[PDB]
């Protein structure tokens, strides 16, 4: 087309708007390919994600529409946004390809983890994560799968979350490197099948902060049995009132584990790992409130934002910024034929 041009990217071809130049592959998976590009209209770099075979089957089609709907629910500087969405095909009948354009960031938290950070940068990165997470929650989106590889950063110390609401396979994070498995970051209520609420994301933030501090994965379980053990060995055997909430067989498994005292937080995060004396105490205290097995006793997002270690950055405009829409979960249980999903997606793309 006059507006589009084609560029070969390994074994696929990107047909994109002419404003997007110098495309180069930065990530790839069975579910999509991501290129870095220069956006000549904005004079900014951009990430372009081409969905792979979105109409292969009903599942992929529903997933494609859902990704698009999730992106319109949010509008916050600590959450990746959809700068643009397009298709090079000119009618519904020819319609096949969907391209998503998002901000190109510089690294994910895997890179930050190995760095030694002052309290200002540590707390500020955490504060941005929390602002991002609060916004998702206000939009009816609970992430559940937060981890260093789906949190991205820039050299100006800004931070954005990606892959909210996406299956851990259709996400941008899965397509790119470095990558870490989600198992290490999942809350006890998730791995023990108890159901979860908003502060499921606080546990993950705690695991990530813990890893930024220790420069090593907090709970590197080889599987979900190992995962649970690693948690209890370090944090201690949870209270009886927590265990009573468990389903019958898993409750007995958990109750029959040897009883562990668990290490104190000064033991888990010694001064050795921190730079100033009030700030290390404050960080350790925040950690001891996020890394709490029982969600009923775990700190919420609002209280985390109010915590002394984080609160220094508080700006009500960043915290109380409301989402454009609230995600309708009736979408999760909606059925359409592929052709019907395709028309729905097409309308959203041409919107």
């Amino acid at each position: 087309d006059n507006q589009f041009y084609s560029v070969e990217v390994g074994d696929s071809t990107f047909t994109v708007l002419k404003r997007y130049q110098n495309l180069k592959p930065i990530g790839s998976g069975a579910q999509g390919i991501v290129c870095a590009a220069y956006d000549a209209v904005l004079d900014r770099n951009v990430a372009i994600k081409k969905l792979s075979r979105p109409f292969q089957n009903q599942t992929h089609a529903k997933r494609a529409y859902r990704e698009l709907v999730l992106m319109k629910c949010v509008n916050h500087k600590n959450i990746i946004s959809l700068l643009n969405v397009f298709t090079p095909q000119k009618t519904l009948e020819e319609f096949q390809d969907v391209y998503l354009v998002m901000e190109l960031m510089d690294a994910n938290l895997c890179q930050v983890i190995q760095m030694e950070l002052d309290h200002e940068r540590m707390s500020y990165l955490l504060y941005q994560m929390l602002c991002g997470i609060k916004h998702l929650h206000s939009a009816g989106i609970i992430h559940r799968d937060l981890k260093p590889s789906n949190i991205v950063v820039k050299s100006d110390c800004t931070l954005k979350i990606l892959d909210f609401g996406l299956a851990r396979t259709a996400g941008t994070s899965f397509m790119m490197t470095p990558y870490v498995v989600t198992r290490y970051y999942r809350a006890p209520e998730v791995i023990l099948g108890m159901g979860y609420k908003e502060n499921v994301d606080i546990w993950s933030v705690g695991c990530i902060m813990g890893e930024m501090v220790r420069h090593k994965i907090l709970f590197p379980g080889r599987d979900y049995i190992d995962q649970w053990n690693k948690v209890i060995e370090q944090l201690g055997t949870p209270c009886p009132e927590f265990m009573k909430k468990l389903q019958p067989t898993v409750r007995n498994y958990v109750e029959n584990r040897p009883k562990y005292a668990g290490l104190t937080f000064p033991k888990l995060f010694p001064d050795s790992l921190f730079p100033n004396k009030l700030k290390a105490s404050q960080a350790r205290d925040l950690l001891s409130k996020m890394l709490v097995i029982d969600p009923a006793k775990r700190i919420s997002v609002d209280d985390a934002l109010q915590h002394p270690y984080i609160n220094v950055w508080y700006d009500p405009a960043e915290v109380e910024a409301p989402p454009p829409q609230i995600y309708d979960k009736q979408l999760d249980e909606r059925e359409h034929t592929i052709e019907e999903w395709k028309e729905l997606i097409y309308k959203e793309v041409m919107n």
């Binding site: 510089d106 690294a107 890179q111 200002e120 940068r121 100006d156 110390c157 950055w313």
Partner: peptide, 10 residues
């Protein structure tokens, strides 16, 4: 306070 405006990424 001033927010950090840089991050020493590799």
């Amino acid at each position: 306070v001033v927010r950090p405006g840089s991050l020493d990424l590799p």
